[PDB]
Structure formats: C-alpha cells, structure tokens
C-alpha cells in the first residue's frame, strides 16, 4: 500500500497537509466573496475588488503548491467540502480589511502549528518547504494589511466616505 | 412599390425602427446640451463635458447603425422633428448623472419593446441585430452610470464642492 | 447674473449665435437625410451618400465651434427644436445637388447677416472669428457645388442614367 | 445507436440540416455554371465570371460549415444527388444577376424555415449558429445583388452593350 | 432595496444564476481533484493531469464570468458550500475521461434549463449572454471528450497499459 | 454557330471533355463524403479526414482546369447532374483507402481513353494538355495510395485499432 517513493513521511504530517489544503481552499473562497462584494454597484470600489481577487488567486496557488508537495513525498490527497464564507455582506472597507487580517493571522498560526508538528517528527524537508514558500510571505502580507488599516483609520472620520474614496484611488489604485 | 430585396420584414418592425431612430437622435441632442452646459465658465468641469460629449457621439453612431439596418432590409427611412432637451440648466453633476441614467433606462426599455415586437413577427435577423449591437452595451452603460452616482453620493456632503472637484479630477479625468 | 468674463458682448450677438447654432443643426439633419436617401437600394449611388454624409459631419463640427465660441465670450447657450428636412424623397442626383446648393447659400446669407450685426455693435472678436472659420469655407463649398451641377448638366440627357453612373464613379468616387 | 455526445438534438433538425446541405451544394454548382458561362469567348465578361466564382466558393464553404455543425452535435450526414443547374445559357448579365438574386432569396427562405423549426424544438445552439453564421450574410448579399441590378438597369438601354461593358469594367472590376 | 440599475431582471433568473455559479465551482473542484490524482507517482500520466488542470481553470473562469454578469444586471450574489468530488480514486484514464464527459453533459443540461427559464421571462440579454459565452463551448468540449474516449477504446485491450501510454504521449502530450 | 476561335477541335473531343468534367465533379463529391465520414465522433480519425478533404480540393481544381481548357478551344460546356457517392458508411480506414485507390484508377483509365481519342483526331494541343497536367499526377497519387495501403496491412492484425491509431498519428499526421 505504501508508495515506493515514501521515506521519512509520517501519517500526521500527511493529515496536517490535507487540513492545511482545505483551509487554503476556504480562504480562497472567502477572498473571492470579498472581491465580488466590492464589485457591486452599491459599493463601487474597484481597487478593493481587485486587491481581494489577487489575494484569492494567491491563496489558490498556495493550495496547489501544498498538493504538489503532498504528491512528491508519497502522500495521498484527500479532498473535503469547502465551507462558505462567514458573511454575505462585508460592510465598509475598513471592516473587510480587518476580516482579511484575521484570516491571514489564522492561516499563519496553522502554518506554525504544522511546522511544530514537522519538527516533532524529525522531517527536515517539510520544515524547509514551509520556511521557503509560506512563512515570510505570510509575515509580509500581515504587515501590509496592518499598514492599510492604520491609514484607513488615520483618514476615516468625520468624512468617512471621502476618506474611503481617496484611499481607494491613491493607495490601492 | 415593395423593394426587390424585402423579405420577412413587417410594417410594424419598420415603424418601430423609425421611432427608435428618432429617439436616438433626441438622446444625442440631450447629451450635446448636457456637455455644453458643463463647458460653461460658471461650472468649469471639463471631464463632465468630455464624458457627455462622448455619450452624444455614441448615440449618434447608434442612430446611424439603425438607419443602415433599415436600408439593408428594404425599409424606407422617415425622418421627424427632433425635440429639444428638457432642461436648459442641468444643475450639479450629481443631477446630470441621474438624468443621463434615466435617459439610458428609457432607451433600454424601448429596445426591449422592439425586441418583443420582433419576436412577435418571427424575424430572427432583427432580434440578432438588437442582441449583438445594443442590449449588452446599454447594460454596461447603465452599470457604469450607477457606479458614478454612488461614488458621487459617497463623497458628497458636507463638502460637496471639493467632492465634485475631486471626482472630476480623479475618476472622469 | 452677467458672467465674470463677459466683456463687449451684446445680447443681439448672443441671440444671433444661438439662431445660427440651430440653423447649423438643421442643416446637418438635412444632409444626414440626403445621404441616407442615396444609401437606399432603389437608388444605390454610394459616392453621393458618402459626399452628403461628409457634409453633415462638417455642419455638425461647425455648430460645435459656434457653441464653443458662445461659451468663451460669456454667453449662455439656448437649444431649440430641430425641424425635420423638407423632403423625404430627394429625387435624382441633379436635384439633391441643387438642394444642397440652396441650403449652403442660405447659411452663407445668415453668416453675412451675423457679420453685419457684429460690425453694428463694434465687436472685432466676433468678426474675426466669422472671417477666419466660416466665410471662405462657405465660398469654397458653393463653388464646388456649382462645378458638380454644371458637369452633371453637361452629361445629363439623352442618356441620363449612364451619365449619373459615370459621374458617381469618376468624380465623387 | 445514438451517439454518446448527442443531447437536445432532434431527428427533424437533422434531416433539415441535411436538406440545407444539399441545397447549398446545388447553389454552388449553379454559381460554377454561371461563372464558366461568362468565361466563354462569345461573352468575354471577365469580372462577371470572377464574381460568380467567388459566390460558388462561398456557398461551398457554407455547406462545409453545415456539415461540421452536423458532426459536432452527434448527427449523421446523408449525401444525396446534386441536380444540375436550370439553364445552360445564362443570357445577358442583367438576367444572370436576377437569377442569382432569386437563388439567394430561396436559400434565405430555407434558412428562416430552419430557424423556425429550431425554435419549435427548443434548441438554442442551432438558433445561435444560424444567427451567427448565415442570416446577416444572406441579407448583405441580397442587398448587394439588388444594388447591382438597379445600376445595370439605370445604364441599360438604348446602348445596352456599352452599358454592360462599363459596368463590368468599373463596378465589378 | 432593489438596485438603481435593475431592469427586466427576475428573481428566478437570479437564483438560477447563483445555482449555476455553485455548480461551476463544484465542477472546478472536481477537475482539480482529477488532475492531482493523475499527478501521483503510482499513476504518472502527466498529460492527463495537465488536461484536467486546464479544464479546472476554464470552469473557474466561467464561474467568474457568471458572477460578473450577476453584478452587472443588479442581482446580488449568494455563495454556498462547495461539495467535495465524488471519488478519491479516479481509476484508469478511460474512466476519468468518462466522468469528465458526464460532468460536462450535466453542466450543459443546466445551461439549457437556464436558457428555458430566461426565455420564459422575456429576458433577451440573458439568452444572448448564454448563447455567446457558454453553449457552443460546451458542445465543442463534449465533442472533444467523445473523440478521446473512442480513440482510447480503439487502442485499449489486449495491451491496455501500452495503449494508455501511447495515447498520453501522442494525443494529449 | 461555331465559335470564331475554334480550330482543329472535334465534336467527340468536346463531349469527352464534358464527360471527364462530370466524372471529376463526382470524384470530388465522393472525397468530400469520405472526409466528413472520418470527421465523425464515432470514428475520430482527424488526419484521414484532412487527407480526403485535400483530395477533394485537388479534384475540384482539376475539373475547373478542364472547364477552362474547354472554353479556350471554343467548345461549349454542358453541365449534368452529379450522382451521390456509393456509400454512406466508409468502414475502416483500410477500406476507405482501397475505395480511393479504385476511384483514382478509374479516373486514370478515363484520362487514357481521352488521350486515345485525342490522338485519333490528330489534336496535339489536347494530348499535350493531358500529358502536362493530369497523367503524371495520377500515377503519383496511385503510387502514394498503394504505399499507404501496404503499410496499413503490415501493421493491421492482431491489434488493428492500435495500428490504425499509430498510422493516423505518424504517417498522415
């Protein structure tokens, strides 16, 4: 049953990769919903939609990378249902940005837990892969999301709408 | 009397094309008036004028397309008077945009009624022509006008004038 | 009420510009009707249609130039109804050419009357504008229309149809 | 027996495609005969021959397009005999043009009947295919044939031969 | 509540678009699973994986197109859970191809039902959109899948493995 | 009645050219049917279809060449009905190739009989024309068809289907 190429790959590190795979798919779905909310005519903030769409594409490519890694090491991929996003209305841009930040922090925590599991089982390849492809990019994305939120807050009230328009036109545009 | 090339063309589908022709001409006249209102020195919003002038040119070309279609199918074109626009003063930019939206919705309703008449008389060529050249563009234009109006509203009060200046400079410019 | 930029501009020279504006629009409408008559399949003279369509475009651009001049000097533009062309059938090409000539002569007379009014009120800018953009072009157009008519007459009878075909193919084509 | 890919394709819409296929082949044969009549030395009108040869090639390509459509939807093609053209002598150019016009009108009527049958059976693909590839081109061809006939008639008598030579040299050449 | 741009858009045509959206997402998920099955080392058929991955990308882009259409017409998008693929092991290449064919036929049936609903409510824009972007491509894809299956069957037994290798190397490669 | 340019052209050599013309048209029809049989989805051999389609185009051009020759020498062309192909199903590729070979041999025999008739009437132009344009190409085509058949036979049984696939992919592709 075990693949001819499998070597130094544990059952736990396979189930964890599958769960991370599902989580990345769910994140991509959430970002798709976020972007196509801001694509609506009652919102009409183009650059927000483009930003979230790019985030969704990046999450999808990361899930594909995980699946390729699973196949290379001799693991077998198991696909599960993808749960729909939390909200159907994502409110103002200040709140969407804060929901994206929380999602990114959750995914980063999951990656760190996976790294802990990998170092538990003495698997240098998995640790190297996670370090190379995931952690630093997650830190950069979280830093960028933090900057955007503080700038939105700096502008913000009293004239919230003008502020949201100018942030859309200057920063993200 | 009937043209040598006429075939599967009904009297009703000819009168309707003529009426649509007149309506398109009237729309072009209205957009010309809109643009040359904003060209005035007491308004001085250039990009609004350019936008409405482009709308007028598009309406004119659509009327010419209808006239060409009428000639190809063997119909005879009848030209009627073009009534002057409703207003001489088009108020702020928020109101001009809302008058353009209403005009576009009226023209779209007329096109849908023409399509209904065409399918009544079993004329696939007219339905194909309307579908290809008119409907989708009307939907796109109405969507674009809706986005502009919501953004203008988002900025808007308290500082309406600064908002109208920044929308002119960023979006339409 | 009077514009901040208005200076040496009289009420009469504003109403006259508006009337000339309406007359140019009516001329453009007439030329559109002329061209789309010859676009018909029972006439089928392409070059005549192209010629009249070019005339219509030129008249439209001249009306736009008048409107720009009105806006620059501080006048306010007033748009009125555009009356439909005189005829629905424009007969042979010899008669269309003679209706175009009469229309051009009428417009030239209107321009000369406007110049007389301008010199009445001691307004050098309006006289310079009319001289630069309108008079010489009107003279050239009338001369060209006269040449075409005499050539059509030279060919003409007995074989009128062959003559009209060869004039269409050689001169206007 | 039914093909694995067949779906929403009716027996009637298959027989009709086969009959249209045969009709297009017959039209191509007729146009070949027309062109190679005018290629003769007692006629010697080159441009007429080239025009009819182009018509024949277009009809052939349309028949091939129908056959490809039949194969894509899971239908089976049935080929029948191609009947020879009506005439062996196609008379003057005025009469050939009028026989081409009648053939085109017949084919257009057949296409409209096929569209009626397609909408009877609730088949959107066939209606879309007919609308996209056939109807508008048929209308354009009929309009062009009508123009040529009226110009030939305009020239025509008394000097019919000179007229036919000049139409050959100028229009079709 | 109703959007400013909504016109001639029915509740039914909105729910149907949402359901089609979910179905396209599910199809993309299934094709992703198919490709990453054949990416495994115990299968090792590269071209099959690339083919199914391309299918998944196409399905994703089609879902995005549907979502854009929903937003343009004034509808509001509702996202639901995406169910996991049917199988975890997709067997030989002959069976994967037959599961892809069935999925494509199901999606085509759903599109035809949506077209029926659209023509029920007298909505020409939706019918034109479906005809332009979806139906013909579905027919082409089903035809291509049918060809591949018959060729695989032609080779096939007795030497099934060599046949599957040569089909992978020649046709899909 | 006799053409001004006719010289050293016999009635027999005219009827024979007409019959050869009809035979070439029939051959082109047969090759069209052959190609569009292999275009079907239950056969799915592309290169066979392309090969037979090329054969059909070549036969058509040869018929046109014969018609031009007939017109140059002062003969008058007579078109007759084109009979439909023998079969509606052309079986495996081995049998289609053998039906093409027989058709080519029949046409070559007809050409040789025409040459015999031409030398009977002391007509060097016709003999030169046949020698230059037809005979050698017929020999080359028959040789090529013989090679393909022997290679198909060499592969062939036991694994006929794999053999037909590899011949399609390598030789004709």
From Swiss-Prot, chains A, B, C, D, E, F:
Q: List positions binding Fe cation 1.
A: 24, 59, 62
**A Gene Ontology cellular-component term:** extracellular region
Catalysed reaction, written as an equation? 4 Fe(2+) + O2 + 4 H(+) = 4 Fe(3+) + 2 H2O
Q: In Gene Ontology terms, what is a biological process of this protein?
A: negative regulation of cell population proliferation
Q: Which UniProt keywords apply?
A: Acetylation, Cytoplasm, Cytoplasmic vesicle, Iron, Iron storage, Lysosome, Metal-binding, Neurodegeneration, Oxidoreductase, Phosphoprotein
InterPro entries xref list: Ferritin, Ferritin-like, Ferritin-like_diiron, Ferritin-like_SF, Ferritin_CS, Ferritin_DPS_dom
What result follows from mutating residue 24 to A? Reduces iron binding and oxidation rate
> Looking at the keywords, is Oxidoreductase present?
yes
Q: What is its EC number?
A: 1.16.3.1
One Pfam family, please name it: Ferritin
Q: Name one GO molecular function term.
A: ferric iron binding
Where Fe cation 2 binds, per the record, is at: 59, 104, 138
Subcellular localization: Cytoplasm; Lysosome; Cytoplasmic vesicle, Autophagosome
**Limits of the Ferritin-like diiron domain:** 7-156
Where do the coiled-coil regions begin and end? none
Q: Which disorder is it associated with?
A: Hemochromatosis 5: A disorder of iron metabolism characterized by iron overload. Excess iron is deposited in a variety of organs leading to their failure, and resulting in serious illnesses including cirrhosis, hepatomas, diabetes, cardiomyopathy, arthritis, and hypogonadotropic hypogonadism. Severe effects of the disease usually do not appear until after decades of progressive iron loading.
Q: Spell out the family assignment given in the record's similarity comment.
A: Belongs to the ferritin family.
Q: Partners and quaternary state?
A: Oligomer of 24 subunits. There are two types of subunits: L (light) chain and H (heavy) chain. The major chain can be light or heavy, depending on the species and tissue type. In the human liver, the heavy chain is predominant. The functional molecule forms a roughly spherical shell with a diameter of 12 nm and contains a central cavity into which the insoluble mineral iron core is deposited. Interacts with NCOA4; NCOA4 promotes targeting of the iron-binding ferritin complex to autolysosomes following starvation or iron depletion.
What is this protein identified as? Answer: Ferritin heavy chain
Tell me what organism the protein belongs to.
Answer: Homo sapiens (Human)
What gene name is listed for this protein?
FTH1
């Amino acid at each position: 049953s075990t693949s001819q190429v499998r070597q130094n790959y544990h059952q736990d590190s396979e189930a964890a990769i599958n769960r991370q795979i599902n989580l990345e798919l769910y994140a991509s779905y959430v970002y798709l919903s976020m972007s196509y909310y801001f694509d609506r005519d009652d919102v009409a903030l183009k650059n927000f939609a483009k930003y979230f769409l790019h985030q969704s594409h990046e999450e999808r490519e990361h899930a594909e990378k995980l699946m390729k890694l699973q196949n290379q090491r001799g693991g077998r991929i198991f696909l599960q249902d993808i749960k729909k996003p939390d909200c159907d209305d994502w409110e103002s841009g200040l709140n969407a940005m804060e929901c994206a930040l929380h999602l990114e922090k959750n995914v980063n925590q999951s990656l760190l837990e996976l790294h802990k599991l990998a170092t538990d089982k003495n698997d240098p390849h998995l640790c190297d892969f996670i370090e190379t492809h995931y952690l630093n990019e997650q830190v950069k994305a979280i830093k960028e999301l933090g900057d955007h939120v503080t700038n939105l807050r700096k502008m913000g009230a009293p004239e919230s709408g003008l502020a949201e328009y100018l942030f859309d036109k200057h920063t993200l545009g």
